[PDB]
Amino acid sequence: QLETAELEKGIVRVLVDVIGHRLARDKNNRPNVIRAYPSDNSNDKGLKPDQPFITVYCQDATTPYGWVLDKFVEDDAVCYRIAFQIPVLITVNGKGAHSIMLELKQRLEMSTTRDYLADMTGASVLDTGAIPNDYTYLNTDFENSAPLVVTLVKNSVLKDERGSIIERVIVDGELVYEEGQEPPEYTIHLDVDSK
């Protein structure tokens, strides 16, 4: 199954291991990779972490690959498999954000990294966008940000608990000489079971 929340969680763990040697460390010496719009229970907001930090944000989830990729039957349930394409926005904030972002791009193509990302997420990278060197004016100085749009593709399998598959077929057939003949010339009754 596909859950955007789980996908963002999976990406964050990957970014910590992949690009962690260039970010800042908190009180637990954990590289500052956070999910966008942080918030705990109810309205408990989240503080802006230290500089060189990474923000992960799943922009949306489109399905340009058709309504249903395939429909198979599991043990006793009909399972639909839909193909999704999730654009995830990874943005690095802080001084020298562009240099940090560039390293991640050249590191998101390595086979070892993508194999790691394929695990614990279940998705595979489709492509990586362009990195704009953005300068925004907060209050006094300019904060460097380098957003990047990583596009992921994943297959979600959901089970319809109201399937009730076929196991027996009963066929009644008649043979006639012309279109009509209310008394059929010969009658066919079939009964095929899975036993």
């Binding site: 598959i165 066929v171 000489y177």
Partner: protein, 442 residues
């Protein structure tokens, strides 16, 4: 060691065979062969276990003469009830012998020769105690005392007693009213299609026809009684053809021939359409080689028109001598249905059953789900199965209607049941006889 080229010419004859829907089975009351449904592939093979006067060999020769040889012939045995009885008085110490054989491992002889004072019986009752004491015969052989009948009981099914001087006589086949014989033969193998029998009694013949009507097979009989070629009203006579027609049995073929007693002409009829395909043939006008025309037992002349018309009333087929060419006419079953239609229908069921079996058992494209896609899969197989009939020139058009998923009751889905699937095909007939009304010769 084998030579580089191994050549072995023999001054034998032709006999190239052909394969087609249906394999004949002959229910013969015999004593040889291992279990039921022995089988045979050539006339020589059927002669290595049967004699010329033996019923099975007589049937085998007729079926296997033709020209397109049938691939294989199945021969089954009816379970046997050998009865023993002393024909004379017991004289002092006259030696009596008998050997009972069951399964494969039983060849125990038995001698009593103990009648010093007087027996007037005894010996048979003495055998009863002895026959129930043999270590390898004790189980499987049920006996009695009369006033004996060595039948079978439990586990072992085949029994056989044979002597030289005293008796070991009779046959008295246990297999009763087909059902008993059929139940035994079904347990062994059910790959046969055409069924016949050596017995010709009214009780037995009427029993098979009712029994065959239940399952998907065709029964080929042959009657020769005179009482069938005289009656023109069905509900007047008690002849077997009349009995079959009255019961409306569509899976029983009757061939009225004068050799129906000592020979089995139905074998020739089977071997006319069995080698070929199913439904792409006409069992009507047929030039059966070897067998002669239907002769009158009283005059030894071919059947007259009224006699044939009386036969047509009972739907029993005959051999009409048209242009002085023995031709099996009618080609219809006792139920009024053409034989090819019955055979084609049986093939259609087999093909539909097999093709539909693949989705359910072999899970060809996966388990069938209960929606519009799953029902469509079933329609495709049914439509494909009927399409082979059209290519076979059996049907001409078909029309399959399936229920819509939304119109299916909740009960069927919970039971995982799909009903209300119907198809409607149109048969393709065959021209068997014409009527040319010439205008004039002005």
């Amino acid at each position: 060691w084998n030579p580089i080229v191994n050549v072995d010419i023999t001054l034998n004859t032709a006999g190239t065979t052909r394969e087609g829907f249906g394999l004949p089975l002959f229910l013969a009351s015999t004593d040889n062969f291992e279990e039921r449904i022995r089988g045979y592939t050539s006339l020589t093979e059927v002669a290595e276990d049967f004699d010329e006067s033996t019923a099975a060999y007589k049937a085998a020769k007729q079926l296997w003469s033709q020209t397109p040889k049938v691939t294989q012939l199945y021969i089954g045995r009816r379970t046997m009830q050998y009865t023993v009885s002393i024909p004379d008085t017991v004289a002092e110490g006259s030696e009596y012998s008998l050997t009972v054989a069951i399964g494969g491992g039983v060849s125990q002889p038995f001698q009593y020769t103990a009648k010093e004072n007087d027996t007037a019986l005894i010996v048979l009752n003495e055998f009863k105690s002895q026959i129930e004491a043999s270590p390898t015969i004790k189980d499987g052989v049920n006996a009695s005392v009369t006033g004996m009948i060595i039948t079978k009981a439990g586990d072992n099914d085949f029994v056989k007693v044979t002597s030289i001087t005293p008796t070991t006589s009779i046959a008295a086949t246990t297999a009763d009213t087909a059902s008993a014989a059929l139940a035994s033969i079904e347990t062994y193998s059910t790959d046969w299609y055409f069924i016949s029998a050596e017995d010709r009694t009214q009780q037995f013949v009427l029993a098979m026809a009712s029994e065959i009507q239940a399952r998907k097979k065709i029964f080929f009989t042959a009657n020769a009684d005179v009482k069938a070629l005289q009656g023109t009203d069905l509900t007047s006579a008690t002849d077997v053809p009349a009995q079959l027609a009255k019961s409306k049995y569509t899976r029983t073929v009757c061939l009225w021939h004068h050799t129906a007693e000592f020979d089995y002409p139905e074998m020739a009829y089977i071997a006319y359409g069995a080698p070929y395909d199913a439904g792409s043939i006409a069992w009507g006008n047929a030039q059966l080689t070897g067998v002669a025309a239907s002769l009158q037992p009283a005059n030894q002349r071919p059947l007259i028109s009224i006699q044939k018309s009386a036969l047509d009333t009972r739907s029993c087929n005959f051999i009409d001598l048209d242009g002085g060419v023995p031709v099996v006419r009618r080609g219809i079953t006792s139920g009024g249905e053409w034989i090819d239609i019955v055979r084609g229908v049986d093939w259609l069921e087999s093909d539909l059953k097999t093709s539909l079996r693949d989705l359910l058992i072999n899970q060809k494209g996966g388990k069938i789900t209960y929606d519009d896609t799953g029902i469509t899969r079933i329609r495709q197989v049914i439509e494909t199965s009927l399409q082979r009939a059209v290519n076979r020139k059996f049907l001409s058009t078909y029309t399959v209607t399936v229920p819509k998923a939304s119109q299916v009751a909740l009960a069927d889905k919970k039971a995982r049941i799909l009903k209300d699937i119907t198809f409607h095909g149109i048969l393709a007939g065959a021209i068997l006889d014409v009527d040319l009304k010439g205008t004039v010769a002005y």
